[PDB]
Write a protein that binds this ligand. Structure first.
Ligand SMILES: *[C@@H]1O[C@H](CO)[C@@H](O)[C@H](O)[C@H]1NC(C)=O
Ligand SMILES: *[C@@H]1O[C@H](CO)[C@@H](O)[C@H](O)[C@H]1NC(C)=O
Ligand SMILES: *[C@@H]1O[C@H](CO)[C@@H](O)[C@H](O)[C@H]1NC(C)=O
Lengths: 445, 445, 445
């Protein structure tokens, strides 16, 4: 719905709320087959240019098949093995004797078919390319005689077109050791992906969600190479199942909060930690520290719980009361008052220190705001750019309401002499306990 | 001009000077159009192989158009939004009613044309592919009758060639959610990029600079998908404007500086922080901490100010006097004396500790220098490789002059017992103040 | 042989042993040539569709040649320069006058040939594409007359096929500033790579190793653009030489080890540092901290010593006795008891703290183990998944034997009040010395 933002002057941090999240909690695997032609070289005296073109493209087909064979003989392990057991188990099932013949029988008359494997998985299989029928019907009469038959020029062009998808799949599967993500249109055409979404056991609003966000679905999918066996090329496509839908999500933005003394070396800094995406999830909060783990479209966020931490919901209280005992709100400390800016969803946080020239401009009016020393904020309403030193940032012009929450910078509550300026993952209460200990070593003496 | 280097034995750091910098300070946006054919399926009884090939390639054209349509319906946000407002504003301008008709009229007779949009931007537009003219003139008479007309085989091949650039642009725009960088030759041919440079409002020496460094220009450019509307495919190419030209730049190299005691656990280490590229910029220094933010060609550096910090010019005094009060020169401390080497522009810094076998060799003479324990340096004059433990590095054979600046290692000025061995972003004066405080807790008692 | 694992309950760490390593210690360079046609535009009045198709593809050939020329005029430096001196030296040798004519003479009658350059390097050269013969024999009679001769349609298709590899090599060399890795099948076909392996001065078991792991060989190879000169396109392929073969390797996995008090803020944490791959190497241990520097296939590991550290073999004693004085076993400390899990080679380490719901399940039985608070471990025997909070990990189903080494968590030997909770690269003995100093400031008073 409405994206809103809140800047907290006291902690030099902002929270962008109103996003609807879709968290991946499951996988839906599907088998993708390509019917190949088990042919061995058939060479006869041929020299007309059309026969040469056919044998050349046919050698590129045989090399693609042998390349897929040496790729499946030794498949290198990936750091994603912890996220593909749902498809690797299917490659292991297909290696069973008689199972590849089962899917070859189910896709004998139609392109799509549900197949109950010998492990209880009712998987959906597809035959996206039929080269055994094309090579054995249109090409073999040309190459398996005493002298080779002459093909028409339309066949030469049609065979380069059909063989092309095989060659490109062999390129992607070869350079990535059998595991590719995102899933390209060569692995699965957009038409095939959308048709696979319609056949998926999900609600119509959820099919509409994945169909309206097919590129995000591709970036969160996997293509795993299985086996080439018995005139069958098989590989597993692992598509995301979003077990969490429309859950509230928010993005925390943090920036250094320093004191603004005029004598360098007498200033202390503080920055809230754990900036990133937060989503309500099953009575707790799912936190995503890495930036590429959440894809954003307008008000909607698509995250993968694979690289998340699970935090108590009280972690949100660091945004309303950071000194609050229900949650130990952590900060990092330093004496590095270097100017910077953070572009948020509806504005910009500016940490200006020293002699830095910080400003906020409108495209037609020029400079409309000059920041003084400290941490401040400006909304995108009327602001186009923000300059900090020699750097110019662009402000997101997305509609929403910003709220400037005034408050005393908490860095002012600390005596500089006893401040712990060296903490990376330290608590508010951790710093207060270190201050009680450093004040005790000087107070008693 | 002449690249020179200076190794500082006192701080285990080196500075490579003499580079001429080109910093990005602006964007030059340009609209790239592809005239499409608004056709709906026209199917008649056709079976000759040439008609089938034409309808097959025509279906791949219709799917590319519908794929671009679902890509433009929901465009996922990128982390680069802070750097593309200059082009996103044009996509927003094109969505206005009547504006796409304006550029369609300006490019009605010619390929290139300057167009004054309805927002005051005099942008340069180009028509790089004309599919409406080709489909409506060469293909529609073949498919919009009672029975389909027969095309010659040259047309089938020419249509696969023309439709190819559309299909590849749809692949790049699809997998990257509409924002690609670098800009491929499919988005913009080298001929089109060089012609776009000649038409750019810049000096002839600056056009010669971008034309001689077109790959760096591509890596620092963006291609943003706009709209497919009214037989027009439009997307914005955002090219860099280097507001800073020929500015002096230098690269700081740092390596751990430890003491060389024979009893492990009694040694302290120190490393200068903020290694990377520095450029003089508008009365201050622009620092680039990330390595991929500066592309290097011979004596020339191309940086993006988007990921830079602005520092006072006194930051250079950490290279001549690190104990100098005009700038608080920061270090990080530890007790981790692990051997390593850093390949600089004209030589190699070697930090050798413990039992590590450190050496510098010439390809034909073998080992020409054996490093003892501590931090040392060797020039590329006569040296080909440097070995530290089981690792062999290659020395850059670029011509320049190295200067070995002798000096006492500053790690020797510190009493080990009271050294702060746990600092990440700590100042020289910060460590000295912590030493005055740790000496006061034991001195009084 | 047999992959085994050992979980150390005392340190919340696991070691996966039994891997056979192949470390890169050398480079084998090879020159790859493409015979080009030195032609200038030859235009005559031509309009038959076949002549147009030929001149169109011929312009794409001329632009690929001029694009390679502006790519070789200014070649941008890469961060890999420290790993390609073995090939850059060959590009520098080829630029000598008369040397490109030497390899052009050796490959005058055959495709492959060993050439002794004028620098003592007996390099192996290959001619993978012959465009000078094809353009000058099949195309020039069509375009160098008063009126252009008419080519047959097979030639138009064959020329688009031959020119395709040139255009794709120009794309890869253009966007990557002349240095590509991995080496694609366009730079070197799998047939050409395997044939190049057979011709390499190595043992038959080592040729069998690289031939069975060609994708790992590609990912650890470089393609460097040299020169386009005198109807010759030359570029260097740098293939890895594994000077270390079948060396024992092991992977260290680490996870936070905290105390499990019921009052938050009273808990201290500890984590072993330096997780990653270790290999026995030349009397020392080669450590690889980055994850992408070692490619794994079953029991075999392929590492690059370029991004490794050399450690004494006593570093393995951190796995059997971390309090052992022969090696200073380092840890990092904090008070951040956030739950997490690490998927190992044969199981999973689980660090469960607070209210987190940690469990281990079997696909058909459901939850088979509930972890209590602390650091624990479960083998893959009977376990399919592990859930920590809202995150589900997949356990690797690889066969091997796990050993649970019981022991007291070492975090319990520390008094919380005087624990140093702020260390990043700190030693066991470092923490004990800081504890002796913090106990001395309170003990005397
Ligand atoms: C520091 O001392 C004050 C005074 O009693 C106390 O209220 C506060 O909780 C202490 N902080 C910690 C972290 O123990
Ligand atoms: C430490 O003490 C000396 C002695 O007066 C003084 O000169 C120096 O500036 C002090 N360092 C700091 C950082 O205060
Ligand atoms: C701390 O004190 C004990 C008691 O003598 C000693 O055995 C130990 O080695 C000391 N630790 C360090 C790091 O000096």
């Amino acid at each position: 719905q409405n994206i809103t933002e809140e800047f907290y002057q006291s902690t030099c941090s902002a929270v962008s709320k109103g996003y609807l999240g879709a968290l991946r909690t499951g996988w839906y695997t599907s088998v993708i087959t390509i019917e190949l032609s088990n042919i061995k070289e058939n060479k006869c005296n041929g020299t007309d240019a059309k026969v040469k073109l056919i044998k050349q493209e046919l050698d590129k087909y045989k090399n693609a098949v042998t390349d897929l064979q040496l790729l499946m003989q030794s498949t290198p392990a990936t750091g994603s093995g912890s996220a593909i057991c749902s498809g690797v188990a299917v490659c292991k099932v297909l290696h069973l004797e008689g199972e590849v013949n089962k899917i070859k029988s189910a896709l004998l008359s139609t392109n799509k078919a549900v197949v109950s494997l010998s492990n209880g998985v009712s998987v959906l299989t597809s035959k996206v390319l039929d080269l055994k029928n094309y090579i054995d019907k249109q090409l073999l009469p040309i190459v398996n005689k005493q002298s080779c038959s002459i093909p028409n020029i339309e066949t030469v062009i049609e065979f380069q077109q059909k063989n092309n998808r095989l060659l490109e799949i062999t390129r992607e599967f070869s350079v990535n050791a059998g595991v590719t993500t995102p899933v390209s249109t060569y692995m699965l055409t957009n038409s095939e992906l959308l048709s696979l979404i319609n056949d998926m056991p999900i609600t119509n609003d959820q099919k509409k969600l994945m169909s309206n966000n097919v590129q995000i679905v591709r970036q969160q999918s996997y293509s795993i190479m299985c086996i080439i066996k018995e005139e069958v090329l098989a590989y597993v496509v692992q598509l995301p199942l979003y077990g969490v839908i429309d859950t509230p999500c928010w993005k925390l933005h943090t920036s250094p909060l320093c004191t603004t003394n005029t004598k360098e070396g007498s200033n202390i800094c503080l920055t809230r930690t754990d900036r990133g995406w937060y989503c309500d999830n099953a009575g707790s909060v799912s936190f995503f520290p890495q930036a590429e783990t959440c894809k954003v479209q307008s008000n909607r966020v698509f995250c993968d719980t694979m690289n998340s931490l699970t935090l108590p919901s009280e972690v949100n209280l660091c945004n309303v009361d950071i000194f609050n005992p229900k949650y130990d709100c952590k900060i990092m400390t330093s004496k590095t008052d270097v100017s910077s800016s953070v572009i948020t969803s509806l504005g910009a946080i500016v940490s200006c220190y020293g002699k830095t020239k910080c400003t906020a401009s409108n495209k037609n009016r020029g400079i409309i705001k000059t920041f003084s020393n400290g941490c401040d904020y400006v909304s995108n309403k009327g602001v186009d750019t923000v300059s900090v030193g020699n750097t110019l940032y662009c402000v997101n012009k997305q509609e929403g309401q910003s709220l400037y929450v005034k408050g005393e910078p908490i860095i002012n509550f600390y005596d500089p002499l006893v401040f712990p300026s060296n903490q990376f993952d330290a608590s508010i209460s951790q710093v207060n306990e270190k201050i009680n200990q450093s004040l005790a070593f000087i107070r008693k003496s």
